[PDB]
Amino acid sequence: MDALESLLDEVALEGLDGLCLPALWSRLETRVPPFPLPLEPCTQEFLWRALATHPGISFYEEPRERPDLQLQDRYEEIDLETGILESRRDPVALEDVYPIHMILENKDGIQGSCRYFKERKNITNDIRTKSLQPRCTMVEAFDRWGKKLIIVASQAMRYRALIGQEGDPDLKLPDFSYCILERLGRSRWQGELQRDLHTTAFKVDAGKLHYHRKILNKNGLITMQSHVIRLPTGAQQHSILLLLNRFHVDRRSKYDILMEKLSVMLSTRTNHIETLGKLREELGLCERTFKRLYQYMLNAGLAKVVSLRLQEIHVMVRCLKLLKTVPPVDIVFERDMLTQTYDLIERRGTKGISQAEIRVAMNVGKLEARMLCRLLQRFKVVKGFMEDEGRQRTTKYISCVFAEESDLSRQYQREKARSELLTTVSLAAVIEEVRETYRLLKRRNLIIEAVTNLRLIESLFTIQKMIMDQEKQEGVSTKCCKKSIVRLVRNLSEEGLLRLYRTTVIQDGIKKKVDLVVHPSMDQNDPLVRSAIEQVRFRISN
Amino acid sequence: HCRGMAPNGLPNHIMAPVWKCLHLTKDFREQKHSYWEFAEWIPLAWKWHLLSELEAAPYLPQEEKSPLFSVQREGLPEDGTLYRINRFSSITAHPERWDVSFFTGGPLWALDWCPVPEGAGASQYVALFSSPDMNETHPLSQLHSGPGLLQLWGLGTLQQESCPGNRAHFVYGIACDNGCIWDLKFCPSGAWELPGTPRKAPLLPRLGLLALACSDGKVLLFSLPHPEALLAQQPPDAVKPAIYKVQCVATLQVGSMQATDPSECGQCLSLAWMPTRPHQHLAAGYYNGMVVFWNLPTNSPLQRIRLSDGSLKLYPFQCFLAHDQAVRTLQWCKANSHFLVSAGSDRKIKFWDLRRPYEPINSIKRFLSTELAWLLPYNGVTVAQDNCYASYGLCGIHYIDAGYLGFKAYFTAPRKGTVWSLSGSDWLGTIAAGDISGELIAAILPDMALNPINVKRPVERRFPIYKADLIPYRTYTETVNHHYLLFQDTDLGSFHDLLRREPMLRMQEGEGHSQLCLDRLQLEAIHKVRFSPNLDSYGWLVSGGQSGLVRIHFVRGLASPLGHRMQLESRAHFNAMFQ
Amino acid sequence: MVTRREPAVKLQYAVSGLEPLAWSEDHRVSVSTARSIAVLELICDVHNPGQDLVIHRTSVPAPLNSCLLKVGSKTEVAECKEKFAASKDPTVSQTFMLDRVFNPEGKALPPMRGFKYTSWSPMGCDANGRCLLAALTMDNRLTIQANLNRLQWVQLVDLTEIYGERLYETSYRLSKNEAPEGNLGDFAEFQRRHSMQTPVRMEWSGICTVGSVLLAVLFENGNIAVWQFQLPFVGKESISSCNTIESGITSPSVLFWWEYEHNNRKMSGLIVGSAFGPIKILPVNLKAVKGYFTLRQPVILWKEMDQLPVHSIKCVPLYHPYQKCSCSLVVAARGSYVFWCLLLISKAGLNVHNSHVTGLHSLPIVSMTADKQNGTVYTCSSDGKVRQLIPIFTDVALKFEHQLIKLSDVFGSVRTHGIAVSPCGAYLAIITTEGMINGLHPVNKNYQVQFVTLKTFEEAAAQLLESSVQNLFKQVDLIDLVRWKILKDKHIPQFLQEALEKKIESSGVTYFWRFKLFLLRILYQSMQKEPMEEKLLEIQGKIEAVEMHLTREHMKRVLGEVYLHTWITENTSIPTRGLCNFLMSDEEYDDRTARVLIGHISKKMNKQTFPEHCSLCKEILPFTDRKQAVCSNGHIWLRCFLTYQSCQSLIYRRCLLHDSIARHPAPEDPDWIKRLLQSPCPFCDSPVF
DNA sequence: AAGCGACTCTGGTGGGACTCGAACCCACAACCTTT
DNA sequence: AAAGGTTGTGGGTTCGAGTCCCACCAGAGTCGCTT
Ligand SMILES: [Zn+2]
Ligand SMILES: [Zn+2]
């Protein structure tokens, strides 16, 4: 790319909040591919004239001086063991140069973040004539305004810098989704991690960032990778890496480059077998690293766990072997769509059908099938039962001819009555007290039984394990999450059907979270919770 | 705004648009109808072959007798008897109220009045189709091409001296091998001539030109003789249901010369003739959403070919993809035939300029719609909805301006059920609509040149004609064995104290609150409604439905001295022109 | 032969208007759509290895303001509109309120600001060497658009605005004696004043000769406005005339230019087709240019008035093998048929033959394209059929033979809203949409542009070797087929290499050296952009060698014109002595013609230095190397690849491929280098802009 | 007074966007788990 | 004796569902001016 265009591109790769002059020189010096022309005061005046004479560039005074940029370099790119580790090595999270403040619903359609967007003033006509002749030298401009001089490229230039030449300018994006792009754009070759965007850039639910990120994936403006953060804990965290397509590079991983060497080694060894120690020794690897590689190769399905005697490799020796529904409805001319939809649901009968499965069967839009389900419920001809499957609390719809006899009805009615019994049987080192569907009522009832039969239960894992086995005996394929239990236990706490007591106990230089759950009839002073604390501390003792 | 009360009991500001529509319709037809068209397309006796009893048996609609029914008439003593009538037979008209009921043997799915020039005083006919089987139902996406019978029914002349003791007569039918008929349209004018017209023995005086939208994906065009001219040729001892096999004037279908590739268009769903002289274009809507136009007189070897039997096959001169889904209904503009409207199951109403088909004049996205009516004097169109997407309590019938006046849609009538069919009387400026509830209502529109938002209470402008109830006594025989149809007719003689009379309370308790029934055949449902287009009988309406009963009503309260005045003056002019 | 090319192009907005896809001589594809014109620019990218079509995307925005056709004073039109809308006659009132020409915006009418039609000029019409885009909205705003920079289209002129004013000044009379000052309050005159200036369709002429181009605009009433543009077109300044001819054709549907040559006599006319079916060639009786001449009398191609609307017209020049003379073939889409007519000048004058090729489609033809080099017709209908239709010469006139191409086999069940064909017939571009799925309607509609290979690689390679036009940019669509093969197989096919070496040996014109440079640069990208490193170094050495040869030939030609014009003793705009040194530097320079040329120049050259100075230093630039010059302080200035002057200006021109750079011409430059600076790039033949 | 045509004032629903609740997944330490 | 597959953990990912809340609708009410 040409030097003069690489300047204007860099000015457009910051967002609507643009650059200071010292930031611009820093951005050009840190450019990849390298900036063709060595910066010096006469050259910087020439580049400044290239900005002032360009009609799409515009200049503002912001009310306060901006911080100077950090050294952005995110990644370690070294190791003392074989290869190198390019995991994130954290700089200090100093006060952000570009804290985001989205320009929502703009009447001119210009988009991005700028904390001063309503407050800064244009000084274009002070820096240049309307005939685009520059009125100030760069040194005069920086003397007069300093960091308050902010350079911004026109929206057409900024959006072009995000989509490239192959991208389509006609595509409007929601303001939140556009502000994700320009948060990526200003990162250049080292994209923002999705973790960091929601945690500290946008400060939102991870669900919000994912939801708004969707459109950028759907239109294909950004590329997705898994990436690895090396914490000061020494442990390392998985997170998503977002790279704007211009800046996509296929990032490698230490375990990936080392498993490739093992894959090459085992695939070139004619037997595809070697002992772990030699697999280590040929790569110089420690067992702590290598056991990850071994289990990754196994979890990738590329190899199989094998053991052979030394006389068989030539005493048993551990080795690795490498090895690698509803039918569509024909709409009739002669009946209305409400009649025809009821005819469908009657054919399903006792099992019912979902709104999404109606939609596909009826060949209608999402909003159209929604209105069909609403009307048939309001007419009282069809009844809706919630059913949890997968991640989704769907509704299944059954005609009132069958609804009472349906398994969903019967199972729900049993667990409702069972719940009414289990509630009405209720009685009339430093502990802290915390603040419908068939399967959900089953899980509620099972916990209420447990706290009724075992007035204390020693951890949330105990609750999960019995629930997991109970659902596995029922044959449920989905596996209950810890968050689902603790949110469920929180619901029972607000209903007052149990206490959850939490603390950390300390013993022999180590600490354990306790998370006692107890029947409401006892407070944290009860000898039973004290006995539980003691018997936990005992088994935690060295 | 004109004050005072009309003698029929409606306010004059409510009746005044009805009285205006008489003159506007007369002034239009004088300019843009004609007394004779398509002079070559005249019926020939040798093209009409009478089927024997054995040959007709596959075509007759299969129910030999109606469901049992009784009619109660507002303010008369209760009848208490149950009627039941044979297929192709009629009860006698009620001596005071002249309603007639007749049975066609199957569920009525197409119906049109035979158009007759003003003042002619002719016998009045309806042509209709009723499906062969009461319970079979046909998919949209597939061609049917079964048998079916086109039925022509004479209603008498419908003069005041003729209505007492009137009966409908099944005059003849055409046995069609082209599947069920989804629409019927007669040529709007110039097709009819006096039955006394002297014509040589091979020829027959012409009653009309009738276009059939067939489920076989093609349009059929017939020229109809007057019945007496057929019966003069027919043997004297012939079978009394006169069923004929008839050669088309033309078969109209999508395609091109030597293009063997069968068209994707699917079933033909709706028709419109060109409303204005010489009516030379006919349009159809297709399941694929195309609107297709044929240039009926066309000599051109690229559009016309003559079959070995001598009938024409006509290929279209223009087609365009009007809708992204089946185009269920068309209306062609009367006031200027450069414009057409269509509605399709994508639930858009699209107005078109046929000079510039690449973009509609206006697309309004709405609820799913079944039929449209375009009354001559009003720039917009009144729409009947399928309820499956309307907000509960807001489903019904809407008038929608084409857009220049920019009014909001006018909610002319709330309905609980889907309105299956709609007809606007140009002569009356009133509209009538049939519901799966089995109720037939009429409504008077305001003068839609004026903003509808001033219409403080539209309920004063609507009234029921009748409601059919099933009275106990998902298939036809299981329903008929255990129910009968109670037809509750209103007193259309006047609208005095309307909002306190029981049929309005019954209707108002139906609107909004009543719940649709789905565990039955819908045997009460009404499927077609048609006001008479003729100035003679202009105040008459016909309707029919799932029962295969067809019922005729005279809306005496909307007939008026201006219609009588215009009938007498048109009679005088007609009697001077033809003798 | 027909297979899909990999990138489908997504469209954000509904495809809109008449015959909505077109492919320009400049390899920009425009689709007219409800909110923009999307322009797809095909680049034979030499900087990346991706096998897809490298489609650069730009768009013309739809206008923000609805166009009103001027029919009278702002007060008098307002009272007339009130009069008609309030009329108690159903016909007058509803005719006014329905017709969108009288009502381009309203309280509840959707604005018609999307595009009705688009047409691409010939090349060389823009201020750059590029073509202009004529764009017509559905509210009848006709505009000319250009992409002067790469990023943004700008409107150069609105022609409806000008024509409306000129009609108003002449009181809507073309002949001032011929018509009354008819009252605007009469609906026939009101409608006429709208109809007489509502544009239906439009086409550009070829380049007349200073260059000029015509634009003929067809109006609803059968008037045609023939605009004349001076070239390069820069706006209203370049509109040399507007002249209106009355065709008299009622309801004219479509227009195309006829241009023809016989015995080196130029002739031309306008062919016009009615929506009611007939087709007639008008003689363009009015024009100012002296080199062209016009047909003497109208000829009727189809007379039948059968009301099959003439939806499209195309024509192609041919040479008839048996009549042994040049002839013109006209093809026109009429309903579902193709009308064809062959026009042949002979001693008898025009000899004319016509027919309808029949059975093509069971629905009307929605678009048509002609392969200008062969007369191969393509035709399309919304059922997704596309039919290739090959003209076969007959002892007199033609026969057409035709075959369906199964888009089903490449895209599945599909609707097609338009087709276009690349200037060499290399690709067919198709506006695809979701088709009927086993008789069901598709739930959601999404327009796309998709491409299919019309030619095999071997035919594209052969046609490039035997190319009569011998410019690569005229043939981007063929060298893209060659590019796709090389990137796919990571080697140059041997027969192409051997044949190209034979052409370079036997003919050696710089076109073949440019073709070699293309193959080698695509080869370098193919092999992942140490035997691979040795191979990369080898072929990069070959690229540099042939790149150096093309430079030598251009430098020789530049000095080979400095010698011809008056000696620029001030050395004003060419580094003459530096170029002479660069052309004597090496013993490689065996070419005696260059050596004697620089001999004669160096005899004539001034002994005074007249050096080139670095503007940031006022210190000399030595002229060491082709691409760039440096001063002692270490500044780096690119050199103009057309004149080797250093591009020290803050704005300068860049090749379409960014492979080469050029200086802007300045008033100090003599005419001959102001002409030289209009050359295409010496390496890629692309516009240097 | 009785009536009219704007001008409000009041309960009800859907359109697209978006909160919601769930299982799913990383990579580590814990150690139960095995010859 | 003498040690590794097997598992639970805090946090992020993501998938389709139902929910939101504003604009719009249909009806009834207000009342300046007229009749
Ligand atoms: Zn310098
Ligand atoms: Zn170049």
Which properties best describe this structure?
heterotrimer; A: 542 residues; alpha+beta; Arc Repressor Mutant, subunit A; 4-stranded antiparallel sheet; 3-stranded antiparallel sheet; globular; C: 689 residues; 34 strands; binds zinc ion; DNA-binding; transcription; tfiiic; tRNA gene; B-Box promoter; DNA recognition
Topology of this protein?
The complex is a heterotrimer of chains A (542), B (579) and C (689).
Chain A: H1 3-13, H2 21-29, H3 41-52, E1 57-61, E2 121-122, H4 124-127, H5 138-145, E3 149-153, H6 155-163, H7 175-185, H8 194-201, H9 206-219, E4 222-230, E5 236-244, H10 254-268, E6 273-275, H11 276-281, H12 287-299, E7 303-309, H13 310-313, E8 316-322, H14 337-348, E9 353-354, H15 355-362, H16 366-378, E10 382-389, E11 392-399, H17 400-403, H18 407-424, E12 432-433, H19 438-453, E13 456-457, H20 460-474, H21 482-494, E14 499-502, E15 504-507, E16 510-513, E17 516-518, H22 527-540
Antiparallel strand pairs in A: 1-2, 1-3, 4-5, 6-8, 7-8, 9-11, 10-11, 12-14, 13-17, 14-17, 15-16
Helix pairs in contact in A: 1-6, 7-9, 8-9, 10-12, 15-16, 18-19
Chain B: H1 12-32, E1 48-50, H2 53-56, E2 69-73, E3 89-90, E4 100-103, E5 108-113, E6 125-130, E7 148-154, E8 169-176, E9 181-186, E10 206-214, E11 219-225, H3 227-233, E12 243-246, E13 250-252, E14 268-273, E15 281-286, E16 290-295, E17 304-306, E18 312-314, E19 318-321, E20 329-332, E21 339-343, E22 348-353, E23 362-365, E24 369-373, E25 381-385, E26 396-400, E27 410-414, E28 419-424, E29 430-435, E30 439-444, E31 462-472, H4 476-480, E32 483-489, H5 502-510, E33 526-531, E34 540-545, E35 549-554, H6 561-577
Parallel strand pairs in B: 2-32, 8-12, 13-18
Antiparallel strand pairs in B: 1-12, 3-4, 4-35, 5-6, 6-7, 7-8, 9-10, 10-11, 11-13, 14-15, 15-16, 16-19, 17-18, 20-21, 21-22, 22-23, 24-25, 25-26, 26-27, 28-29, 29-30, 30-31, 31-32, 33-34, 34-35
Chain C: E1 4-10, E2 21-23, E3 28-33, E4 36-43, E5 54-61, H1 74-85, H2 90-98, E6 115-120, E7 133-137, E8 142-146, E9 154-158, H3 159-169, H4 187-195, E10 199-208, E11 212-219, E12 223-230, E13 239-246, E14 252-262, E15 265-274, E16 279-282, E17 299-302, E18 310-320, E19 325-334, E20 337-346, E21 349-357, E22 367-370, E23 377-380, E24 386-393, E25 398-405, H5 407-411, E26 414-421, E27 427-434, E28 448-453, H6 457-465, H7 476-489, H8 494-506, H9 510-526, H10 531-562, H11 576-582, H12 592-604, E29 613-614, E30 619-620, E31 628-630, E32 636-638, E33 653-654, E34 661-662, H13 671-676
Antiparallel strand pairs in C: 1-28, 2-3, 3-4, 4-5, 6-7, 7-8, 8-9, 10-11, 11-12, 12-13, 14-15, 15-16, 16-17, 18-19, 19-20, 20-21, 22-23, 23-24, 24-25, 26-27, 27-28, 29-30, 31-32, 33-34
Helix pairs in contact in C: 6-7, 6-8, 7-9, 8-9, 9-10, 10-12
The structure holds zinc ion (2 copies).
Chain A binds a DNA duplex (35 and 35 nucleotides) through residues 174, 194-195, 198-199, 205-208, 210-211, 214, 226, 228, 235-240, 287, 291-292, 295, 298, 305, 316, 318, 355-356, 367, 370-371, 374, 388, 390-395, 461, 478-484, 487.
